[PDB]
């Protein structure tokens, strides 16, 4: 004797654009939250060591949010003018913040009382500030002077290394993970520069012609750079020193860009981008950077960032809207005598000779309609299938199963008008869809065959059939012009 096969629920033939696992993941990112700020929001960052925090820049307001309660946890506001950008050290204790007056404040996280150091670079406003990622005492900044300056936080006074060769309004840079000596700068005239520090550095090692003003640059690999500039964005390789791809599947200039990897996801690595149109998209660097997901917020979304790879906590997705809106979308995550009495439970038998097991796996819920099918209660199974809160698809598989076993007239013999009417209501609802149409058509055929005389009698049933006839003529028509347009397909091949 073998166990009882489960009644297999039906699957329709597939429809185009099935929901992919990527869609499951990135739409499960949910439970949106909105915060209104004073002014535009420029830069966003996350704390790398214990990912439980992220930082937001704004007009004279640097706010630290906690990954646990999504409210502001800390505020820095000693800023005399518009603070541009915030960056957390690769070991977290310390953040840098580049203002517009012409200086950077570098001081340790969680302590707005200490201005640990104030460094005065060139007097022009500084748009970009960051920490290194291979050294922890080297901090990079640039200012409208188009010269990017590397300071060593041990020496506050002289630029540890000035760096020129740019063109106009330098506003991005990044480091190369593998090489602790290689720095890429996104100038604002395009033409990405690549520098090696251990040389003189006056000129870049080389340049890349990203024709539009390029806005952002990230190192996705020790070998691959992602360049956010203009309407499209491009991906470059280092050793070959040639561009690899572009994606331009947006409306406006791509604006914000960030890469994450090696985190729990059916996708191994992810790249997210912000394109001025509510549209933030998720690509992967393994499918040649194809579009995988997207959201739309109203205003021009200027910044975007994700919780890093070792979040181990409720993951977050931060978007900054030039309309002055911070938005976040997240995914959440007896008595001692009695025990000395019966202490034999938590043993599981490690150290005996031969271990037997036989217990049956706890099978899933046996629904009532399946139960009626099992116990031959065909009419009861049908009525259960027509109780309200059941899924249309499951009801369809129920009807298909009953037809396949063939007890159709069986389940319908004892039926009286009060029993028919829920059947007929579902019939009227279901006739519209395709597979639903076929099966319900068969069913109503046999219903008519049995119940002509009671149809004569009952007044309600007659208007039921009237409505049925209206709908069936309508769909007959729609099918007809459907066949006409397939006719044009055949022509216009």
């Amino acid at each position: 004797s073998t166990a009882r096969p489960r009644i297999i629920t039906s699957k329709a033939p597939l429809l185009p654009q099935q929901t992919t696992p990527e869609q499951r993941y990135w739409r499960q990112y949910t439970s949106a939250q909105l915060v209104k700020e004073h002014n535009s929001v420029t830069h966003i960052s996350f704390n790398p060591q214990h990912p439980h925090d992220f930082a937001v820049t704004s007009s004279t307001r640097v706010q630290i949010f906690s990954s646990r309660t999504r409210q502001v946890i800390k505020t820095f506001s000693r800023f005399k003018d518009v603070v541009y950008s915030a960056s957390f050290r690769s070991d977290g204790k310390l953040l840098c913040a580049g203002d517009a007056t012409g200086l950077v404040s570098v001081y340790d996280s969680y302590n707005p009382r200490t201005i640990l150091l104030s460094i005065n670079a060139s007097t022009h406003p500084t748009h970009v500030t960051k920490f290194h990622t291979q050294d922890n005492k080297i901090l990079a900044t640039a200012s409208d002077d188009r010269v990017t300056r590397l300071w060593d936080i041990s020496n506050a006074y002289e630029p540890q290394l000035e760096l020129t060769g740019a063109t106009d309004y330098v506003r991005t840079l990044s480091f190369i993970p593998a090489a602790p000596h290689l720095v890429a700068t996104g100038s604002y005239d395009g033409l990405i520069r690549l520098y090696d520090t251990r040389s003189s550095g006056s000129t870049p090692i080389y340049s890349l012609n990203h024709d539009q003003p390029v806005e952002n640059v990230i190192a996705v690999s020790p070998t691959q750079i992602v360049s956010c500039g203009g309407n499209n964005f491009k991906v470059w390789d280092l050793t070959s020193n040639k561009k690899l791809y572009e994606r331009g599947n947006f409306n406006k200039a791509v604006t914000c860009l960030d890469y994450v990897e090696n985190f729990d996801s059916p996708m191994q690595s992810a790249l997210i981008a912000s394109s001025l149109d509510g549209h933030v998209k998720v690509f992967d660097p393994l499918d040649n950077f194809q579009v995988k997901f997207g959201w739309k917020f109203s205003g021009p979304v200027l910044s975007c960032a994700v919780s890093p790879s070792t979040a181990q906590g409720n993951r977050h997705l931060v978007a900054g809207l030039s309309s002055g809106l911070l938005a976040i979308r997240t995914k959440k995550k007896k008595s001692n005598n009695f025990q000395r009495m019966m202490r034999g439970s938590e043993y599981q038998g490690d150290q005996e000779h031969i271990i037997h097991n036989d217990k049956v796996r706890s099978q899933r819920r046996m629904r009532a309609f399946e139960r009626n099918i099992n116990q031959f209660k065909w009419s009861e199974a049908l009525d259960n299938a027509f109780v309200p809160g059941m899924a249309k698809e499951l009801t369809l598989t129920v009807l298909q199963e009953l037809r396949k076993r063939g007890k159709v007239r069986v389940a319908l013999y004892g039926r009286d008008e009060s029993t028919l009417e829920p059947l007929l209501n579902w019939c009227l609802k279901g006739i519209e869809d395709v597979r639903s149409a076929s099966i319900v058509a068969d069913w109503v055929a046999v219903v008519l065959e049995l119940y002509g005389n009671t149809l004569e009698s009952s007044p309600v049933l007659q208007e039921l059939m009237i409505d049925l006839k209206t709908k069936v003529r309508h769909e007959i028509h729609k099918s007809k012009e459907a066949q006409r347009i397939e006719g044009m397909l055949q022509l216009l091949t």
């Binding site: 073998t2 185009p16 000779h353 036989d358 002509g452 069936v472 099918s479 459907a482």
Partner: protein, 475 residues
């Protein structure tokens, strides 16, 4: 260990072992060289058996027990053949036999000569200055049995006819427990409680050599021509001395060492091994008492050998009459459709008031919301003019998007029908130029073929419904 004592037959093919089973000694013989659980129990709950031996024509064994008596026990016949007795109430310590003479040795230092075939006590016997004694053996003098050996920590050589000791070699500290004649010139003494074995030479009466074990010795056996010595050792191990009687060579080391280990890392001991000319037998215990054997060629094995034996330690009960997982091998695995993708052979794949500007914008980009607005847009004239202003490639992707939209949201189909109609109307030339029309237009194809497939049964339902409708409306 629970195997209190045991010994092979000469030639080592059956082993007789004595162990206790709930207040009774029981003896059992089992084969080694290719289960017979016929065991013999001692009826008395008190008395034990002190020593055992074999006898070769009919084969049997000999049991010297506490009572002061001897049993000659038939092996195949479950019975002691005869109950030899000494005229006293004492305790038999050892026995020995060769030919027909039998000699047994008391604790009270009584010696006894017995005839087997006569079932008789030939002679009681006792001497001077053998105050304590626990070992007896008799030498290979032919059929003569003169100059036998007794021992208690000082080995004594004695002749029978004049009834006096001759040679006393310096023994060990403990009582001695094994005394076996190696050669007509040499005999081995193994004193229990020590790792040191004494090879002694008889005529010179002198200490030839000393042999070192590594743990304490329990059992000694020797091969045919002093070729090898096998020692079962108390931690549970086998020590093999090869040619120990050759050329300070006074102290000689264990040449070869043997242990027994299961796969789970457990160690199990050996007890009463047996060796022969290029043939080695080892005995051990699977369960508490079931004896098991292994035969091998020690001449080719390395100097140190760690035998591995498959034992069922934590193995799991894969019952044969079942599958690996519950099921039984007469079932029939059912219809587990599982998560298969399902498809049909119609998914042809893998082979003036206008809004033209905004629709083309959204399709260059991709926005469900903006597309949804321009689709709630209605006026047919507007749709026509837009498609006229539209560019072909955007038109093609428009067809794909619209058909997908229909496929999901069926109800919208009508207005989307007129949309797709105008689209393929206006932009026919470019698409007839572009080759891979089936795959490029895929979803529209499959959607419309599905509806086509609907048509005939739909007609069937329509006609039956007319039949019934006229039926009841006529009256």
């Amino acid at each position: 260990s629970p195997v209190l004592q045991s010994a092979y037959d000469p030639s080592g093919q059956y082993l007789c072992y004595v162990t206790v089973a709930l207040d009774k000694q029981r003896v059992g013989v089992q084969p080694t060289q290719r289960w017979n659980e016929n065991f013999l129990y001692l009826e008395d709950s008190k008395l034990k058996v002190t020593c055992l031996k074999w006898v070769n024509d009919t084969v049997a064994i000999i049991l010297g027990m506490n009572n002061g008596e001897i049993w000659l026990y038939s092996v195949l016949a479950n019975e002691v053949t005869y109950k030899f007795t000494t005229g006293n109430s004492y305790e038999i310590k050892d026995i020995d036999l060769m030919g027909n003479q039998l000699w047994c040795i008391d604790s009270s230092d009584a010696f006894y000569q017995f005839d087997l075939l006569q079932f008789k006590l030939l002679q009681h016997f006792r001497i001077n200055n053998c105050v304590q004694l626990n070992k007896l053996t008799i030498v290979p003098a032919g059929d003569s049995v003169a100059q036998l050996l007794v021992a208690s920590h000082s080995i004594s050589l004695i002749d029978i006819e004049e009834k006096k000791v001759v040679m006393t070699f310096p023994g060990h500290v403990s009582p001695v427990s094994t005394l076996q004649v190696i050669t007509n010139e040499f005999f081995i003494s193994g004193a229990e409680g020590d790792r040191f074995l004494n090879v002694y030479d008889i005529h010179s009466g002198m200490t030839k050599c000393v042999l070192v074990a590594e743990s304490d010795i329990k059992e000694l056996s020797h091969s045919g021509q002093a070729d090898s010595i096998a020692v079962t050792t108390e931690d549970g191990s086998l020590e093999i001395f090869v040619d120990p009687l050759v050329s300070g060579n006074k102290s000689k080391k264990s040449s070869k060492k043997i242990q027994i280990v299961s796969k789970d890392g457990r160690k199990v001991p050996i007890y009463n091994a047996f060796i022969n000319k290029d043939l080695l037998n080892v005995s051990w215990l699977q369960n508490a008492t079931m004896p098991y054997f292994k035969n091998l060629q020690w001449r080719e094995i390395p100097n140190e050998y760690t035998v591995e034996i498959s034992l069922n330690w934590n193995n799991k009960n894969k019952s044969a009459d079942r599958d690996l997982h519950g099921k039984d091998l007469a079932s029939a695995t059912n219809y587990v459709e599982g998560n298969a993708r399902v498809t049909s052979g119609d998914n042809f794949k893998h082979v003036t008031g206008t809004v033209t500007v905004i629709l083309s914008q959204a399709l260059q980009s991709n926005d469900h919301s903006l597309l949804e607005t321009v689709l709630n847009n209605r006026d047919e004239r507007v749709i026509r003019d837009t498609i006229f202003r539209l560019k072909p490639a955007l038109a093609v992707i428009l067809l794909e998007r619209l058909a997908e939209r229909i496929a999901r949201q069926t109800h919208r189909q009508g207005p989307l029908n007129v949309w797709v109609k105008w689209c393929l109307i206006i932009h026919g030339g470019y698409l007839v130029s572009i080759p891979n029309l089936m795959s490029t237009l895929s979803s529209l194809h499959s959607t419309l073929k599905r509806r086509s497939d609907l048509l005939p049964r739909l007609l069937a339902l329509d006609a039956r419904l007319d039949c019934t409708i006229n039926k009841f409306k006529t009256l």
